[PDB]
Amino acid sequence: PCPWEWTFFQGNCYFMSNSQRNWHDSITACKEVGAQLVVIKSAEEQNFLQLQSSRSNRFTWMGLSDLNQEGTWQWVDGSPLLPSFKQYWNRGEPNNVGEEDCAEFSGNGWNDDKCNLAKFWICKKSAA
Amino acid sequence: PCPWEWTFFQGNCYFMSNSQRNWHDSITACKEVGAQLVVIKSAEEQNFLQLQSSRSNRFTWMGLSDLNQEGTWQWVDGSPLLPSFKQYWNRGEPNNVGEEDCAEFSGNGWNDDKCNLAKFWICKKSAA
Amino acid sequence: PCPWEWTFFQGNCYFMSNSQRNWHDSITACKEVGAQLVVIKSAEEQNFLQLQSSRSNRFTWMGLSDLNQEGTWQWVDGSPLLPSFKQYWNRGEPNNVGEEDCAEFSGNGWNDDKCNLAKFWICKKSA
Amino acid sequence: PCPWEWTFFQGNCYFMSNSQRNWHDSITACKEVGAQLVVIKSAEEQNFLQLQSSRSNRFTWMGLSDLNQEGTWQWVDGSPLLPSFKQYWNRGEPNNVGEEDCAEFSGNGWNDDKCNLAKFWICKKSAA
Amino acid sequence: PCPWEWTFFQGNCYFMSNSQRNWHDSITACKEVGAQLVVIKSAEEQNFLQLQSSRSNRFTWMGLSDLNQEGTWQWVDGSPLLPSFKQYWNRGEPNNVGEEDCAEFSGNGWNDDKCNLAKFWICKKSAA
Amino acid sequence: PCPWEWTFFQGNCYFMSNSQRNWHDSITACKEVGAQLVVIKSAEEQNFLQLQSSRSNRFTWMGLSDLNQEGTWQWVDGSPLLPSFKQYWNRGEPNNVGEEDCAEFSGNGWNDDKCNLAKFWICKKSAA
Amino acid sequence: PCPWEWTFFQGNCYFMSNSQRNWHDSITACKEVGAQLVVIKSAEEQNFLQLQSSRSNRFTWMGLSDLNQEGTWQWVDGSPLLPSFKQYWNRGEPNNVGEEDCAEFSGNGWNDDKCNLAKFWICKKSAA
Amino acid sequence: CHPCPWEWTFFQGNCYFMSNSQRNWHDSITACKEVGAQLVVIKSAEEQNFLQLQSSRSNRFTWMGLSDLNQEGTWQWVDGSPLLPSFKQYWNRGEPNNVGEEDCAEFSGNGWNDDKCNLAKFWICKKSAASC
Amino acid sequence: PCPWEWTFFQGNCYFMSNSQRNWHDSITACKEVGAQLVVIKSAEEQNFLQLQSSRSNRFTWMGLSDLNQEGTWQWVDGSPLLPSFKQYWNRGEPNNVGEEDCAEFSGNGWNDDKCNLAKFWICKKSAA
Amino acid sequence: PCPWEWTFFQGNCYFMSNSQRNWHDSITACKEVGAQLVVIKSAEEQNFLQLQSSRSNRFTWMGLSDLNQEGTWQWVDGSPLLPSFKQYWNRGEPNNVGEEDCAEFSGNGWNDDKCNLAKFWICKKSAA
Ligand SMILES: CC(=O)N[C@H]1[C@H](O[C@@H]2[C@@H](OC[C@H]3O[C@H](O)[C@@H](O)[C@@H](O[C@H]4O[C@H](CO)[C@@H](O)[C@H](O)[C@@H]4O[C@@H]4O[C@H](CO)[C@@H](O)[C@H](O)[C@H]4NC(C)=O)[C@@H]3O)O[C@H](CO)[C@@H](O)[C@@H]2O)O[C@H](CO)[C@@H](O)[C@@H]1O
């Protein structure tokens, strides 16, 4: 079903890292094992993820950014951020303070931060 | 050198679990991948391990216990607890309050706790 | 992918100086081309860089120091030195003999040395 | 032969201050009377000077430093420190502990210390 | 103000000798440069001087003796020992043991000692 | 006069090892052939030995330590380290960094290091 | 209130030894009378001790060390060194020159010296 | 001789008080005035090292007498003195960012952070030691 | 009503310390201010107190112990431990593990611990 | 054999005070521990005691005075002072200057000083 020590959720497998890497570095790592920097597809999936971070209080990268075009948030799979996800941003976010182009789970919601900072991350890939 | 996302350290590879299991279920968990509930061999390893645990703010099992003979602490690989390690016990520990036969990393040093408790754990195995 | 004559490794481009500068002037220099005195983020990157220095038979500065607080090493970007990386110090280091607050690649590992010395250096910057 | 209260020794005059100034300030204080922070030119001079300090147990500055080039000790008159003077350093000196660039008479030999500290000093100049 | 390396205090310059001489050679010494073996006036001057020597860990002569009249103490110039000053003698002085007719600074107070002994001295003179 | 491939110098035979052992092992190793971890008795000897080390730039053990009394360097034959040998320590040595109680030829002089570290060594015995 | 000859100070009794022992032996010594190598816990107390030591002109051990982790000072009762207490180190201390892992009252402040040295010591324990 | 009042901390000629209650920046300033003290104005690196650690070990965010209230971007101590360039290294990474308008300084972990002045936080009072 | 920075609660003034001392050093501390190391008299008081420590998550001393008579817990004011309060100990407490004769607030309840350990403390006294 | 921190020397145990008491008060102090202010009975003993006061440079009382009969020295136990010992007085002692009727170890020998002065002291008694 899911690789050793990965967590199963609705037909998908997730891996909450223990190391901290910058955003692009997080991507090549999920790459190595055939997974993707978690792209959130549904409210249910988001609650589950947000809880994985919330419960351990770790800042975690997700596969969402506005690197290509400031203000225009897009998932690593290319799908644009849906208006129905705005609610997930923490108050005042995304504020792009000092140029923040990457989304992370922070507190009970999301925050945009500098993509060069080292954070925990989550990989995702289809279950067996 | 090491399996994906394991930490390489002085000839060995270490894995910090994301899940929490009681002591015994951890032992069997490490076997599933040809590893073992961490057994500390050197002072240098203790410093490394203790710090990683402390940094992660997580209580973590180590492959040590006095289950077989109260007061007598023995590693899972058989080797006995040397006197040069007794120093790593937290102040007052081991206390066996409520009958604690398994060892964990607690803050600055070691602590004995109930084996039935689910905690994070660490697997160890030699590098390639 | 990488500026002219820079090496490309796991998403980043490293530059091995041919000049020798003191630790500080080695930082100001990577700042002249939007680069940073190499900060080792992973073990594989450490192995790569160690090999680079070792085979060139050169003593080279990395972006690490304990100038701010003796005995507490920090990378030039603020990040702290992880517990696992301490295995890279050469046997006996860091010893601070003669007051050493800057790190370098020496043989198979790291060594603290006087920051006033001119050594080779390595810049780093994302692809 | 020597200014009132100065001391004579081998065609030269020496002034042992009763006040304590930092290294650089000791240097200017000597020029004020056309003298130079003691630059040692011979073994006998060293014995004599070292003895002017041991008798009173006073840590005293001399015209020697490595301020310009760490580890490169040179006298104020610009001449380099001779390998034959290596023997005067106290055991373990110079050790630049916390950055020490100025030499002083300490105990039976020399020690390097912080140039900004106040110490006694000795001026030297030719006798009439 | 004061000459090169002479300490200043209440409109007067004081010189702490680097050499030791007997009481008489000391007076003559101060006269060489038209000065006098320090004669105290105030109580601060005393506190000042007593400190100047207590610090330098040196027994120092002063212009006070009972040479011309055992039991009767007069200053080099002519003034006499005042009842207020008599509190400055250390516990149990002057004792005149072995015939002591000259006063020196000793620890926190004064002591009478043999005038033939070579000790450090202090000259005094008019400021600017 | 001397064994095969040993060096002769002023009535003595010297053997530069090929292996690297800790300090005590080097000691026991020299006895197995009736020699001794080199104890230096004269300046000429010291220059001869230092050269045998400088040539190939190899760190080498000598029968000298301060294991018994820190700061008190003693040769293994029992004789104390004469003050006239002080000049042989490299600059800043002996510094006991991390507790170094064994002496080795290092570069152009001597240095103290950890006795548990394996290095080359030299044996001494009189000629035939 | 206090055993014979011990000194009372703010609820506790202190014993200044007349004998000199190395750090460790000093620790055991205090234990034989149910006391402990003085662990300072207040500015007023630090002043009390620094004075006794200073005035008695004796270098004295206190129950403080960085033997466990270089650069990290800890009292023998396991407690850590408070931030405000770093002001008590003599200028330039701690320097660890020659490898110094034990604290001693030295003059106006504290200095780290080699634990193998014999020095005087101070025991502490509560009054009655 | 008690260089400092009961339960106050003596450090290099001064007395310090780590509060147990939380107050907005202004209420803290006034609070220290009650006992003849002042919201901690830092004068040296060592004082800074001392205070930063006290704050960290206590796991509490704590106000210091510094702000850019009167002039955004320009920081000043409550005693009129300006923020010397040598103290800029003390700001945490990315700070002061002024997010949501922040004009008051606090001890946050390893360094300094600007936060909203109305927030209730612990604070530290300072004043010189007694005559003795 | 209450002293500066002290907390008011139904006719009583309480002081939460930021310093940590052993049980006795705390008693003598509340004495310096005519205060008493807190003695609970009511349940509303207890709930209010447990909260102080509960929120700041701090181990805190109280004037309660079984020092005089192991097993017999008596407040510092003399009063006994009403069978009513008993409900406050945490499961398994007091276990007197390794001889614990002092009470402190721990988590949601109480626990006995070693009187020699340094914890935060609370003073108390009637409001003027 | 000897009390804690007491020195053993041929059958007896001696104590060196850290406190300074007048001669009488020094007598009552030794009685309190069933001891007597050191009364020398042999040469060796004396040689050993002089060193004790010689190292520390402390003026130390001994059980010897000529109070009841000026010029006639007797030990506190009664046994009059023998001649052999009289070779221990320092030059010019006893000089009964200002009327001194108590012996003290001073420098390399003995001296008579005022009994009302506070000085260090030694107690004595056999072992077991
Ligand atoms: C501030 C800090 O260093 N934080 C670190 C943290 O450090 C540890 C942490 O421990 C807090 C408590 O965590 C759990 O509740 C327990 O481990 C508890 O210990 C007691 O209870 C366990 C059972 O749950 C016993 O096994 C253990 O021996 C101990 O027993 C109690 O002992 C006392 C005194 O001897 C006795 O009187 C009690 O009766 C007894 N209690 C019971 C139930 O029998 C911990 O107290 O904080 C401590 C400082 O306050 C540290 O010393 C701990 O090491 O560690 C994490 C993870 O490493 C780190 O992220 C954090 O920074």
Ligand SMILES: CC(=O)N[C@H]1[C@H](O[C@@H]2[C@@H](OC[C@H]3O[C@H](O)[C@@H](O)[C@@H](O[C@H]4O[C@H](CO)[C@@H](O)[C@H](O)[C@@H]4O[C@@H]4O[C@H](CO)[C@@H](O)[C@H](O)[C@H]4NC(C)=O)[C@@H]3O)O[C@H](CO)[C@@H](O)[C@@H]2O)O[C@H](CO)[C@@H](O)[C@@H]1O
């Ligand atoms: C054999 C090999 O792999 N060759 C590699 C080479 O490897 C390194 C090389 O180092 C030789 C010496 O090079 C310089 O002189 C120094 O780095 C020196 O180190 C000492 O001195 C510096 C200061 O100059 C200190 O920072 C350093 O800590 C060390 O100090 C000494 O430390 C000991 C404790 O062990 C102490 O006892 C001494 O008192 C203290 N001395 C002083 C003056 O304070 C080097 O030793 O060879 C070593 C093996 O012999 C290797 O371990 C080194 O890694 O590296 C180059 C560059 O990559 C490569 O070209 C070559 O092939």
Ligand SMILES: CC(=O)N[C@H]1[C@H](O[C@@H]2[C@@H](OC[C@H]3O[C@H](O)[C@@H](O)[C@@H](O[C@H]4O[C@H](CO)[C@@H](O)[C@H](O)[C@@H]4O[C@@H]4O[C@H](CO)[C@@H](O)[C@H](O)[C@H]4NC(C)=O)[C@@H]3O)O[C@H](CO)[C@@H](O)[C@@H]2O)O[C@H](CO)[C@@H](O)[C@@H]1O
């Ligand atoms: C501790 C301190 O403050 N250190 C100060 C230091 O303090 C003084 C120091 O003096 C110690 C001895 O120094 C010399 O040896 C003498 O001054 C000696 O005094 C005796 O001998 C001289 C003769 O040279 C006499 O002039 C003097 O009166 C005394 O005679 C003796 O008097 C007693 C009466 O009580 C009588 O019983 C004896 O028979 C007689 N003996 C002789 C030889 O005649 C000093 O004792 O330490 C003392 C404490 O032990 C202090 O009290 C002294 O002030 O002073 C220096 C100088 O400034 C300072 O730097 C240092 O810090």
Ligand SMILES: CC(=O)N[C@H]1[C@H](O[C@@H]2[C@@H](OC[C@H]3O[C@H](O)[C@@H](O)[C@@H](O[C@H]4O[C@H](CO)[C@@H](O)[C@H](O)[C@@H]4O[C@@H]4O[C@H](CO)[C@@H](O)[C@H](O)[C@H]4NC(C)=O)[C@@H]3O)O[C@H](CO)[C@@H](O)[C@@H]2O)O[C@H](CO)[C@@H](O)[C@@H]1O
């Ligand atoms: C006037 C006064 O204060 N008198 C006090 C006296 O004060 C102290 C005294 O110290 C003198 C020396 O005493 C010992 O020899 C040592 O403590 C020495 O310190 C150096 O060496 C030790 C190791 O032996 C080191 O631990 C120490 O850090 C220091 O190391 C040297 O440090 C310098 C940098 O500062 C460095 O350049 C050297 O390389 C290094 N030396 C070595 C070998 O590594 C003392 O200096 O006098 C000093 C006057 O300046 C005071 O500052 C001292 O506090 O204390 C006594 C006892 O309480 C008191 O009675 C007296 O009144």
Ligand SMILES: CC(=O)N[C@H]1[C@H](O[C@@H]2[C@@H](OC[C@H]3O[C@H](O)[C@@H](O)[C@@H](O[C@H]4O[C@H](CO)[C@@H](O)[C@H](O)[C@@H]4O[C@@H]4O[C@H](CO)[C@@H](O)[C@H](O)[C@H]4NC(C)=O)[C@@H]3O)O[C@H](CO)[C@@H](O)[C@@H]2O)O[C@H](CO)[C@@H](O)[C@@H]1O
């Ligand atoms: C792990 C550790 O060191 N623990 C220390 C702890 O360290 C500090 C702690 O901070 C956690 C968060 O605490 C508060 O929520 C805030 O201070 C928050 O900072 C953000 O929010 C405040 C306002 O709420 C802003 O003023 C501040 O600038 C920051 O803003 C955010 O900034 C990012 C850019 O970096 C931007 O993208 C966001 O949009 C923006 N958010 C908002 C709401 O505007 C803290 O993050 O842990 C941090 C490490 O994760 C440390 O850096 C902190 O120093 O400190 C305590 C107390 O000293 C200590 O006990 C503990 O050991």
Ligand SMILES: [Ca+2]
């Ligand atoms: Ca952008």
Ligand SMILES: [Ca+2]
């Ligand atoms: Ca952006």
Ligand SMILES: [Ca+2]
């Ligand atoms: Ca943001």
Ligand SMILES: [Ca+2]
């Ligand atoms: Ca059991």
Ligand SMILES: [Ca+2]
């Ligand atoms: Ca058990």
Ligand SMILES: [Ca+2]
């Ligand atoms: Ca336990």
Ligand SMILES: [Ca+2]
């Ligand atoms: Ca440094």
Ligand SMILES: [Ca+2]
């Ligand atoms: Ca350093």
Ligand SMILES: [Ca+2]
């Ligand atoms: Ca080094």
Ligand SMILES: [Ca+2]
């Ligand atoms: Ca320098």
Ligand SMILES: [Ca+2]
């Ligand atoms: Ca230098």
Ligand SMILES: [Ca+2]
């Ligand atoms: Ca030095």
